[PDB]
């Protein structure tokens, strides 16, 4: 087996390590199959990509048989299989089998804190933000190793990236020295940033 | 996809041997290919393979040494003209040919014991 890391927004090649010349390709049946869902397959020199991949699949037939995902998913994640059935003489025998395991790192990228000046008093609201990772994130603002109460947060999915987006809003007094740290944690990581304040 | 095959057989007076496979069939079959295999210091070997579409009797070649009868997820596997010292473990392999996707299984193999008349 070969296992291949790509991240989240890259291309991602997934190799037969074997190919079939033009000649023989017409009686060959190539199935790529991710755990025993169907990818696409080929068949009579016929092709058929399944929905899932439909639009952001290219099927590399010279180079390896290989499949070339463009729009990485988090989902496509896992344990592809290429098959190559060849007949000969009776009937279809397999002439290869391949495996590869794809992995798609979406890590959070640093949140970014940024604060504006409200017409409240000494009361400044600072916003923390980062999207585009994978899996659900889970803030929470932390002064002095003690979970704050913020006033709004808002995580959302893009229906079509499978990414997410996190930001919230947390309001303090500008007297006092502040000291704040904004913990991201998706999945068994996290990520955070600090904003400090001072006089 | 799991396989299962007896443990042991021992041969005929002639040199006939059999034994059911049995494999997890997880779906609408229609391709099914099942190949022997013998298996000896490690060192794999072909004994016979067909593919027969389910629901038509399996039928082997004439260069053939084995022959068998499909009955559901059963298979009935005959091999033939065994002399003693081809005695070893016999493998019992099925594939899932079409429609996609495939399926793979491999029993533990059948250990057949054959004896050369006096
Ligand atoms: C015509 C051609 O280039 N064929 C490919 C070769 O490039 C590749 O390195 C090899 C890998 O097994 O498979 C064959
Ligand atoms: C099944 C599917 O997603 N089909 C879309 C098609 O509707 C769209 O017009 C085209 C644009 O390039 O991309 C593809
Ligand atoms: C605008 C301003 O200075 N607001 C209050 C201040 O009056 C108060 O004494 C202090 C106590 O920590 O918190 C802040
Ligand atoms: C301090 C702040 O921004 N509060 C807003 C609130 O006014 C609004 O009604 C609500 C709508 O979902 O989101 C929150
Ligand atoms: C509680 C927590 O996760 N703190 C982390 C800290 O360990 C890490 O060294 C820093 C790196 O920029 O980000 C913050
Ligand atoms: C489970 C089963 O039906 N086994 C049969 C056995 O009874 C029969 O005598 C033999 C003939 O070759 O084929 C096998
Ligand atoms: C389906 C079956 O018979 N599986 C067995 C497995 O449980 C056992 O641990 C192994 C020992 O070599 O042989 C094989």
Redesign the interface.
Same mark, same amino acid.
């Given at each position: 087996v070969i296992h291949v890391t790509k991240e989240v927004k890259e291309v991602a090649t997934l190799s037969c390590g074997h190919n079939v010349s033009v000649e023989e390709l017409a009686q060959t +049946?190539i199935?790529w199959?991710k755990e025993?869902?169907?990818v696409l397959?080929m068949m009579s020199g016929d092709m058929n990509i399944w929905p899932e991949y439909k639009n952001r699949t290219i099927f590399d037939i010279t180079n390896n048989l290989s499949i070339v995902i463009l729009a990485l998913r988090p989902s496509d994640e896992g344990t592809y299989?290429c098959?190559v059935?060849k007949y000969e003489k009776?009937?279809?025998? +397999?002439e290869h089998?391949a495996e590869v395991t794809l992995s798609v790192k979406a890590d959070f990228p640093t949140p970014s804190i940024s604060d504006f000046e409200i017409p409240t008093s000494n009361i400044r609201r600072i916003i923390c933000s980062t999207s585009g990772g994978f899996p659900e994130p889970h803030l929470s603002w932390l002064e002095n190793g003690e979970e704050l109460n913020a006033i709004n947060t808002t995580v959302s999915q893009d229906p079509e990236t499978e990414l997410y987006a996190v930001s919230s809003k947390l309001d303090f007094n500008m007297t006092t020295n502040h000291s704040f740290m904004c913990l991201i944690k998706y999945g068994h990581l996290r990520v955070n940033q600090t904003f400090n304040w001072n006089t | 996809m799991h396989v299962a095959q007896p443990a042991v057989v021992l041969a005929s007076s002639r040199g006939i041997a059999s034994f059911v496979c049995e494999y997890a069939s997880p779906g609408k079959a229609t391709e099914v290919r099942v190949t022997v295999l013998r298996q000896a210091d490690s060192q794999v070997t072909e004994v016979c393979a067909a593919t027969y579409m389910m629901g038509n009797e399996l039928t082997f070649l004439d260069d053939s040494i084995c022959t068998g009868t499909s009955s559901g997820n059963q298979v009935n596997l005959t091999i033939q003209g065994l002399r003693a010292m081809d005695t070893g473990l016999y493998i019992c392999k099925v594939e899932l040919m079409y429609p996609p996707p495939y399926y793979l299984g491999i029993g533990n193999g059948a250990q057949i014991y054959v004896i050369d008349p006096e």
């Open positions: +049946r199935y199959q025993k869902k169907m397959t299989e098959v059935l009776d009937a279809f025998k +397999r089998l | -």
